[PDB]
Write a protein that binds this DNA or RNA. Structure first.
Ligand SMILES: [Mg+2]
Ligand SMILES: [Mg+2]
Ligand SMILES: [Mg+2]
Ligand SMILES: [Mg+2]
Ligand SMILES: [Mg+2]
Ligand SMILES: [Mg+2]
Ligand SMILES: [Mg+2]
Ligand SMILES: [Mg+2]
Ligand SMILES: [Mg+2]
Ligand SMILES: [Mg+2]
Ligand SMILES: [Mg+2]
Ligand SMILES: [Mg+2]
Ligand SMILES: [Mg+2]
Lengths: 142, 57, 57, 100, 66, 62, 185, 75, 141, 144
RNA sequence: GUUAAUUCCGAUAACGAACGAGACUCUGGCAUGCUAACUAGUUACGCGACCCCGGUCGGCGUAACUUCUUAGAGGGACAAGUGGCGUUCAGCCACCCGAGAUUGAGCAAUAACAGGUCUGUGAUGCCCUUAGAUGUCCGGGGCUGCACGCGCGCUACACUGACUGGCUCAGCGUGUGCCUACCCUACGCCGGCAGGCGCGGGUAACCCGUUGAACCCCAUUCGUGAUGGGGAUCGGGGAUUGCAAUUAUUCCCCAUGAACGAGGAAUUCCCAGUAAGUGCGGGUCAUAAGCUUGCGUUGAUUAAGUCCCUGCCCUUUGUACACA
């Protein structure tokens, strides 16, 4: 009946990921495909760990559909890793008790801080007289 | 050159500015290239406010 | 206009217009005390204000 | 009826002043208006050598021009459009009034 | 290195010695106080001045300063 | 000869030619009275344990 | 939820950091337990947050070197996962425990410097750093130009370094540096 | 100086010692099979998947780069 | 209850290639064996019935994003051109193999040269695709 | 199957060139001049052979079939663009040229250029880079 | 003493100051608070397709809205709070809360150099040529020439690898030109390929384009062999550009398959989204990146010190130099 719709973005280096929560059963999928097959699948638990920390009883009442755009693969999976957690925090803060919000923030932040606050590092610009941001070309004496 | 630069300096400070600078560089005063410089008042060299406090020519 | 030139080279072409025009009026009006131009470019009209010292000259 | 004016400029302050003045005119004449939509800024960037000759430390400039395009939608006959556009335009802003 | 220059320090000293009564140990109030009083052009300079004002106000309320 | 563990109680300062060794005074953590000076390679905090192979020889003090 | 376990297999509990100089500088247990050795980073901003990085992530980072391999981190988490699998097969006991044993054995206690040499003892963090560098260097050189894969050259280097079997390159140059420092004091 | 003349195909003595000794190892990787049996790595992979097809070997992990096999349990 | 995005793709493309094998009405070209699939390849494909695999993968990409023409399929199937001594660059796939794949999957009723250009995927092909996906899910569990 | 069979040729001599029999067929054939990885794979695709076999595994009738395909490419459906000496100067016929004809036709083309005294023949004769390379800084090795 | 700093504090015959530094401008980050959006989108709703109520769709249309996108105004962090170290000064270190507890560049100055440019100029003195021209045009050649030495870089020496399929992700940009003759490309046919022939879009958040980029990830083949590493050299052919490719413009196909087994003396650059790997735009451009200038992606080891080496700076000292 009532719209329990929560948009939440989560950002890495350039990759942004917009999670959408609503009322339902426990299905989570990115881009229309579930979490267990998102290549690079070597970092599978780096998507699973908010679900593995909170338990599926927290994600039972909610279904999360996220959009991913920008960056590369590791930045995208860190973006959705952030965005699912922040979306559940915002949903629990706006529609149920915030004591559950406080306990899930506690368990997430004592594990890893990146789940809620973004990594503010972006790529530094190349300067002239060098092949990169700091490094210079090979000096030639004599 | 000395007369002309002090003339434009006195005219430009009586016309009223927070500072002035003129540089005359060339083969004045002999075949060797010399530079004369005539300044007074405050001046800004750095930052952006050279874009909107000093005008150059 | 059916020639329909892009905005990027449009503003560049207007800048080159003001550059060539500034240097042209610099060589023309240096005896008059030429200080610059401002082109108030209307559609269907174009005013072009010369700023100088000896306006009678 | 569905007029659409486009304001290109190089400056930001003058362009914001022009588009805000135009929506003030449309509000005074009490028209339905779409808000001033900002197109992404174009950064024309030229990187040249500072040196006229070849020698030196290899030092480069970054000359850039910025182009800001803000555009407005209004719903009025053409006479209203000519009356509002023919007044109050800053010398740097270039205007393109499309009809459809 | 976070060192306050002389344009921060002279302005902060004369703000405190002309406006001692308006001021306290709260950065976020006396930031708005020095914005209300003086024409500081840039807000970074305003924050530098207000922070060194708070530091000198702690020094004044705890002891004398030169 | 024993190896012996000792807890850092105060850092003194950098030493060496290039400034790559940190002389540090340190107390033996079975008899906490005895404390000595020792030159240490690497990054040190105050309050960590050094595994001294010889409790006897001493570093020079600057 | 409890039971934080590395990749899917191994428990962070039942671990025994033996030498108590490396309690705070080896990060394995009850707060530094993660599922993967991949993290977003921020461990090299300030000075001593190098230690609070989990030790398998530092092993993983110390593996990827020599030019062609810079920044292939998911690759070297794959190599480290296979390396833990092989040592769990061979020893039949806890792989991060035998990693801990490899580091606490492989770390040189005493080295030399210029103050001719004079012997100085190492920092504990510097000892962890030089051990985690040396055993990866030995595994890399033992795997270079060889049919034997690096994913278990790292593994038999780990069991040899934890055994102190002196067939390990890390143990060998540990005793080499302690020998040089024994003569030079 | 030193050179490896590995065997591309089994001699019958090599196939017999593969049937004897290989499922008694604590680790079975194609490298350590080839290292102590003087065979090609491709022949090692083929013989190991053939021995898995015979069903004397567990696979503990499988990858593009290294596939890792162990012996059967004793219990 | 099961669509193709619910399952892994890596074995899906093999299962759909086996489906097209046991179907056998795609009409492979003559030069399947003698061709190299790009200018940026060194050798021919090691698997000889690669044409069914690229047909299945093209069917799957036209499912996930319709309206992909021949140039877009070359963009999908491009990779490194190792230029020997010069540094490597991006290089597209072969146009003729993607054209023959699209014409094969148009001959068999799975794709359709639709309006606004490109190859759209028809409901017959969509039926085939996700029932193969259900077969893959049932074969896994 | 994985055991060595009988009649395992450890070495084949094919087109008066030795072939290491213990390596894989598509790269065992590449020991012959005038045939590389690509041509060897297409010849072993025309000859209906599973490519997984080694070169001592397989039999003499089909290796003579392979050499007939190698010396006669167009007769067993190999296209004209796939060949090394397409549209020859003397006899105008598309042919794949192998391992004695290879250097024979190579010195034929070189002797043609030296005999017409063309610039490329002069550069081959003088022992220089013929394809317009900067010889100022490179190629120092063989020239003393 | 302290700082990135003649940055401050503090001694003090100095006290008040200006330029530099800093402040400033552009940029990166953070806002579920403001402004707005059919040239950006989301969420719902209704059809349409497919699978067994539900799931998927960059399949299609519209009711709200601005979280994502765009960019304006604001705000936001100052060593502010705590605890040490320090005249308790300047400041430094650690930690909480926090988007950040040093983002990066631009501008940069009393002075000098006989550093470079007269080949950027209708900036230019003087000299020289000025009709058999050193002016100007046209044709050909050279600027590439190869016993040698040096500098900037690219490819590599492989198993952390190569090969072949499979899967899956960007951000800078640019795009039809006054003269001026040359734009980016979708989509459809032919061909292995480079490419060729058709109608279309685009002066651009509108079309290429959701820029389906590489590395990476998944699965084969290989098996320590100068081997499927490496791709120089060289032959034969096929296309494009241009008026014209020969001294091979470039691209493609087949074949040939060289040193190179990690590099002595010496030496370059760099400390956080940094180095390095990786590809992509821009400039040059008829053809065109082994370069340069930008952009993203994957993303570390070590260090939070010192004057030992090399630089320069300050103080003191010496001078018969002061065109130094
Ligand atoms: Mg002069
Ligand atoms: Mg002179
Ligand atoms: Mg200033
Ligand atoms: Mg400055
Ligand atoms: Mg291409
Ligand atoms: Mg060549
Ligand atoms: Mg030269
Ligand atoms: Mg003149
Ligand atoms: Mg002429
Ligand atoms: Mg070689
Ligand atoms: Mg050649
Ligand atoms: Mg050097
Ligand atoms: Mg004397």
């Amino acid at each position: 009946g009532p719209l329990q719709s929560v948009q939440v973005f989560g950002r890495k280096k350039t990759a942004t990921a917009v999670a959408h929560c609503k009322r339902g059963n426990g299905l989570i999928k990115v881009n229309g495909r579930p979490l267990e097959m998102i290549e690079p699948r070597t970092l599978q638990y780096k998507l699973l760990e908010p679900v593995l920390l909170l338990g599926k009883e927290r994600f039972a009442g909610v279904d999360i559909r996220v959009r991913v755009k920008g960056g590369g693969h590791v930045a995208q999976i860190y973006a959705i890793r952030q965005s699912i957690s922040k979306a559940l925090v915002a949903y629990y803060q706006k529609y149920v008790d915030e004591a559950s919000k406080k306990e899930i923030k506690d368990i997430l932040i004592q594990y890893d801080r990146t789940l809620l606050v973004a990594d503010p590092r972006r790529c530094e610009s190349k300067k002239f007289g060098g092949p990169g941001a700091r490094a210079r070309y090979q000096k030639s004496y004599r | 050159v000395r007369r002309a630069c002090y003339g434009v300096l006195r005219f430009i400070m009586e016309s009223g500015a927070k500072g002035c600078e003129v540089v005359v560089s060339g083969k004045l005063r002999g075949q060797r290239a010399k530079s004369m410089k005539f300044v007074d008042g405050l001046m800004i060299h750095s930052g952006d406010p050279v874009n909107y406090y000093v005008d150059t020519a | 206009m059916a020639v329909q030139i892009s905005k990027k080279r449009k503003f560049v072409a207007d800048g080159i217009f003001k550059a060539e025009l500034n240097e042209f009026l610099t060589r023309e009006l240096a005896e008059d005390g030429y200080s610059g131009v401002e082109v108030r470019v209307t559609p269907t009209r174009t005013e072009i204000i010369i700023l100088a010292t000896r306006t009678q000259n | 009826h569905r007029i659409r004016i486009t304001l290109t400029s190089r400056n930001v302050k003058s362009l914001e002043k022009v588009c805000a003045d135009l929506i003030r005119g449309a509000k005074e004449k009490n028209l339905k208006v779409k808000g001033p939509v900002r197109m992404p800024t174009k950064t024309l960037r030229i990187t040249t050598r500072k040196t006229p000759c070849g020698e030196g430390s290899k030092t480069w400039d970054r000359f850039q021009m910025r182009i800001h395009k803000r555009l407005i939608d209004l719903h009025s006959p053409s006479e209203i459009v000519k009356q509002i556009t023919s007044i109050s335009i800053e010398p740097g802003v270039e205007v393109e009034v499309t009809i459809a | 290195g976070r060192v306050r220059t002389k344009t921060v320090k002279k302005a902060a000293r004369v703000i405190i010695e002309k406006y001692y009564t308006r001021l306290g140990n709260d950065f976020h109030t006396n930031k708005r106080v020095c914005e209300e009083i003086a024409i500081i052009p840039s807000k970074k300079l305003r924050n530098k001045i207000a922070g060194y004002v708070t530091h000198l106000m702690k020094r004044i309320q705890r002891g004398p300063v030169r | 000869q024993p190896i012996k563990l000792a807890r850092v109680t105060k850092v003194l300062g950098r030493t060496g030619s290039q400034g790559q060794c940190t002389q540090v005074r340190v107390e033996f953590m079975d008899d906490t009275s005895r404390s000595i000076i020792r030159n240490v390679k690497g990054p040190v905090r105050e309050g960590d344990v050094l595994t001294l192979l010889e409790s006897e020889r001493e570093a020079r003090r600057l | 939820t409890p039971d934080i376990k590395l990749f899917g297999k191994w428990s962070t509990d039942d671990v025994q950091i033996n030498d108590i100089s490396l309690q705070d500088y080896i990060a394995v247990k009850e707060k530094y337990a993660k599922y993967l050795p991949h993290s977003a980073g921020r461990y090299a901003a300030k000075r001593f947050r190098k230690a609070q990085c989990p030790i398998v992530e530092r092993l993983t980072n110390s593996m990827m070197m020599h030019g062609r391999n810079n920044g292939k981190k998911l690759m070297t988490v794959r190599i480290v996962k296979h390396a833990f699998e092989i040592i769990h097969l061979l020893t039949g006991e806890n792989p991060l425990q035998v990693l801990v044993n490899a580091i606490i054995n492989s770390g040189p206690r005493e080295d030399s410097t210029r103050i001719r040499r004079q012997a100085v003892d190492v920092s504990p963090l510097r000892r962890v750093n030089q051990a985690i560098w040396l055993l990866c260097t030995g595994a890399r050189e033992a795997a270079f130009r060889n049919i034997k894969t690096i994913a278990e050259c790292l593994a038999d280097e780990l069991i040899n370094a934890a055994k102190g079997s002196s067939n390990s390159y890390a143990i060998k140059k540990k005793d080499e540096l302690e020998r040089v420092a024994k003569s030079n004091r | 100086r030193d050179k490896l003349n590995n065997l591309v195909l089994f001699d019958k003595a090599t196939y017999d010692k593969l049937c004897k000794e290989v499922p008694n190892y604590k680790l079975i990787t194609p490298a350590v099979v080839s290292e102590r049996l003087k065979i090609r790595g491709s022949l090692a992979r083929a013989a190991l998947q053939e021995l898995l097809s015979k069903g004397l070997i567990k696979l503990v992990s499988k990858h593009r780069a290294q596939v890792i096999y162990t012996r059967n349990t004793k219990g | 209850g099961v669509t193709v995005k619910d399952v892994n793709q890596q074995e899906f493309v093999r299962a759909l290639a086996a489906f097209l094998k046991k179907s056998g009405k795609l009409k492979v070209p003559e030069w399947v064996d003698t061709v190299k699939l790009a200018k940026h390849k060194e050798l021919a494909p090691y698997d000889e019935n690669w044409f069914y695999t690229r047909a299945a993968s093209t069917a799957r990409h036209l499912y996930l994003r319709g309206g992909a023409g021949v140039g877009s399929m070359t963009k999908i199937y491009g990779g490194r051109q190792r230029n020997g001594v010069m540094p490597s660059h991006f290089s597209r796939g072969s146009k003729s193999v993607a054209r023959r794949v699209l014409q094969a999957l148009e001959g068999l009723k799975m794709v359709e040269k639709d309006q606004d250009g490109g190859r759209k995927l028809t409901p017959q092909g969509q039926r085939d695709l996700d029932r193969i996906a259900g077969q893959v899910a049932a074969a896994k569990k | 199957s994985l055991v060595i069979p009988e009649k395992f040729q450890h070495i084949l001599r094919v087109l008066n060139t030795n072939i290491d029999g213990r390596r894989k067929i598509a790269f065992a054939i590449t020991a012959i001049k005038g045939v590389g990885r690509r041509y060897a794979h297409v010849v072993l695709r025309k000859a209906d052979i599973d490519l997984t076999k080694r070169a001592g595994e397989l039999t003499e009738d089909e290796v003579e079939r392979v050499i007939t395909i190698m010396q006669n490419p167009r007769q067993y459906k190999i296209p004209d663009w796939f060949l090394n000496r397409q549209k020859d100067v003397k006899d105008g016929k598309y042919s794949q040229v192998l391992a004695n004809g290879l250097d024979n036709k190579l010195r034929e083309d070189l002797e043609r250029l030296k005999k017409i005294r063309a610039h490329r023949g002069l550069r081959h004769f003088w022992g220089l880079r013929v394809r317009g390379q900067h010889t100022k800084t490179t190629g120092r090795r063989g020239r003393t």
